[PDB]
């Protein structure tokens, strides 16, 4: 029969390709990921719930049937012309610039977007919005005072590992609110101001999040196939990759913030 499997020795090139932390501004800095086929459920779940049970809180099964499910991912590109392919190096670095950017961006849309369980995001990929997941809100006028209240309702067991996410439109704010109350020098060193690790700032996020993203947002990717084809009318190729992904949430450790 004609079909040939992708050589396994070529696969691990793509395993480290799908998962990468090199980029500046993503939740990939803080969340957990992997590439292992064998794992079937969040590995640490048992150590979590009992420690939560030490407190009055314990888990509601917000995710049904913890065992993962296989959701599909797809990529497509068109190189401009064989002249790019006539050479070697600029080709190879061009592709890796693309995929990482596309893969990383795509999971990010599913989580943070205001698309909120409809519209552009496929209805197949439609539960996983955090707004749609059922986190409880915190509110306050002062954003500085606001998130102290929210870091501190967290269970004190996992308070040591927590990280805040923020929009640049929010970033410009607090440094203003600080200056009026002083601590201008302290401002610009957010990690010191609020004891936290890995503070993050981006622009796709619309509202402020807090919580231990190390244990909550476990995920895994696995490649399947990499295809290649010539197209003769144009000078172009048709490169593409398709893979499988899936992801989970533990909303109790997380808290959203909403200032007025």
């Amino acid at each position: 029969f004609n079909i040939q499997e992708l050589p396994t020795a070529r696969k691990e090139v793509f395993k480290e390709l799908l998962v990468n932390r090199e980029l500046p501004q993503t939740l990939r800095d803080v969340i957990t990921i992997t590439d292992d086929e064998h794992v079937e459920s969040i590995p640490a779940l048992s150590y979590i719930k009992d420690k939560l049970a030490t407190n009055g809180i314990e888990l509601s099964l917000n995710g049904s049937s913890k065992y993962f499910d296989r959701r599909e991912g797809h990529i497509y590109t068109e190189v401009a012309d064989s002249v790019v392919h006539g050479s070697d190096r600029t080709l190879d670095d061009l592709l890796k610039e693309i995929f990482i950017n596309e893969c990383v961006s795509y999971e990010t849309t599913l989580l943070l977007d205001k698309n909120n369980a409809s519209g552009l995001i496929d209805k197949d990929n439609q539960d996983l919005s955090l707004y749609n997941q059922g986190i409880k809100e915190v509110s306050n006028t002062s954003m500085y005072d606001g998130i102290k209240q929210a870091m501190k309702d967290i269970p004190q067991t996992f308070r040591r590992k927590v990280s805040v996410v923020m929009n640049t439109e929010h970033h410009d704010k607090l440094i203003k609110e600080l200056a009026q109350m002083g601590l201008g020098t302290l401002a610009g060193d957010l990690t010191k101001l609020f004891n936290v690790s890995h503070v993050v700032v981006t622009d796709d996020a619309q509202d402020i999040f807090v919580g231990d993203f190390g244990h909550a947002i476990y995920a895994k990717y696995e490649p399947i196939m990499y295809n290649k084809k010539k197209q003769a009318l144009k000078g172009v190729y048709q490169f593409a990759l398709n893979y499988v992904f899936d992801i989970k949430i533990v909303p109790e450790l997380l808290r959203i913030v909403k200032v007025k």
Binding site: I3, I224, K229, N242
Partner: protein, 253 residues
């Protein structure tokens, strides 16, 4: 453990044919390239006869030769990519089933069609060339046709009709009785019966003459990168035709 699991397990997938054409049972079937046949085989033995009939007009209208004319079509498989790589299914026979089933019901479509869809006109029995005879009941209409059929064609006649029409006539031949529940359909008309759903209205004729030719085939493979699919296409050309129109008549209410 794996022994305590049952051991009728298969490791492999198969399937029955998805669809098939009933007219292959009785019709002629060929492979010949550029085929020709004569219309009438034995001409009349004696000087004097009365057997001259509209068949004679039919042969006068068109030559004694029979021309089989190529006609194109195509079939697709349309499997995906995940099925291949995400598991060891070994479905290589499955696609083979869909393809040779593909060409099959193509015949069943155009040979039995209400709208002949220009280019496919001369092959459907409902084109209008064949006659129509009428009866009060479906049972009466079928036997009324058999009276029309000349002695050459009556002796090896054959009927095609939908099974639901055999069920209504036997009920009225009955009287609210479940005594016909095993009657072979041959015994009530006196000729072989064959059943398919597509035949709205019955037909009847000899079916030595309805002939088929597959001239050539071509098979190839490719990929569709955007959707991941492999196509596994097949294309070929065939013709079908009725040697004479006094052979194949129509019943009706």
């Amino acid at each position: 453990g794996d022994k305590l699991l049952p051991k009728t397990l298969s490791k492999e997938i198969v399937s029955e044919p998805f669809a098939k054409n009933q007219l292959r049972e009785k019709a002629r079937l060929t492979n010949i390239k550029g085929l020709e046949i004569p219309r009438v085989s034995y001409t009349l033995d004696d000087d004097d006869f009365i057997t001259d009939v509209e068949t004679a007009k039919e042969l006068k209208a068109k030559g004694d030769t029979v021309k089989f004319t190529t006609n194109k079509f195509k079939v697709f498989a349309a499997i995906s990519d995940t099925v291949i790589h995400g598991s060891d299914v070994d479905l290589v026979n499955w696609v083979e089933n869909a393809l040779q089933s593909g060409l099959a019901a193509k015949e069943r479509k155009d040979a039995l069609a209400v709208s002949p869809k220009s280019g496919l006109e001369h092959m459907s029995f409902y084109n209008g060339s064949v006659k129509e005879v009428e009866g009060a009941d479906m049972y009466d209409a079928i036997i009324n046709a058999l009276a029309d059929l000349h002695e050459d064609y009556r002796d090896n006649a054959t009927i095609y009709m939908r099974y639901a029409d055999y069920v209504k006539i036997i009920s009225v031949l009955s009287n609210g009785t479940t005594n016909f529940f095993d009657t072979p359909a041959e015994k009530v008309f006196g000729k072989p019966v064959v059943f398919t759903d597509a035949a709205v209205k019955p037909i009847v004729g000899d079916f030595n003459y309805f002939g088929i030719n597959y001239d050539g085939t071509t098979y190839d493979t490719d990929k569709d990168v955007k959707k991941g699919e492999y196509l596994f296409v097949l294309t070929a050309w065939y013709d079908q035709q009725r040697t004479l129109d006094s052979a194949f008549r129509i019943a009706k209410a």
